[PDB]
């Protein structure tokens, strides 16, 4: 990194998606309606999943066809459950502890697998004591 970005650490997030058809919901234009879920975990320096306590809030910014498309969750693993008929790209806003910053994590909600996981690297500052202490749980700081 350069400049102010030197004072950061990288962490890997894993976005975990699951989906299945709901037969009791009438297909929309012959397309089945599916229940789907997204959860977010943190990986440590060994690759083990641990609670993503470095975020005090996650907002899923859903496709505009959803009612109340901006859904806020405050407790790991920030699980969202919805229903729909089509996949879409979405930004997941994760808010670091101590107002350290919003990160927009690009996700794609799709039906290509019953469940699938995607890892994303984010850069996190080291100037908020409580966040730094929390970061120690998932690796070097």
């Amino acid at each position: 990194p350069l400049g102010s970005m030197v004072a950061t650490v990288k962490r890997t997030i894993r976005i975990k998606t699951q989906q299945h058809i709901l037969p009791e919901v009438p297909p929309v234009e012959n397309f089945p309606v599916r229940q789907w879920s997204i959860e977010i975990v943190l990986l440590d320096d060994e690759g083990k999943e641990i609670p993503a306590t470095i975020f005090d809030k996650v907002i899923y910014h859903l496709h505009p066809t959803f009612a109340n498309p901006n859904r806020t969750f405050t407790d790991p693993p920030f699980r969202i459950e919805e229903q729909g008929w089509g996949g879409f790209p979405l930004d997941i806003s994760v808010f670091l502890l101590e107002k350290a910053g919003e990160r927009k994590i690009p996700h794609d909600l799709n039906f290509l697998q019953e469940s699938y996981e995607v890892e994303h690297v984010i850069q996190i500052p080291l100037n908020k004591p409580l966040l730094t202490e929390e970061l120690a749980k998932s690796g070097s700081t």
């Binding site: 397309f31 008929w85 089509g86 996949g87 879409f88």
Partner: peptide
């Protein structure tokens, strides 16, 4: 499985 919005 390839359905998109």
């Amino acid at each position: 499985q390839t359905a998109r919005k």
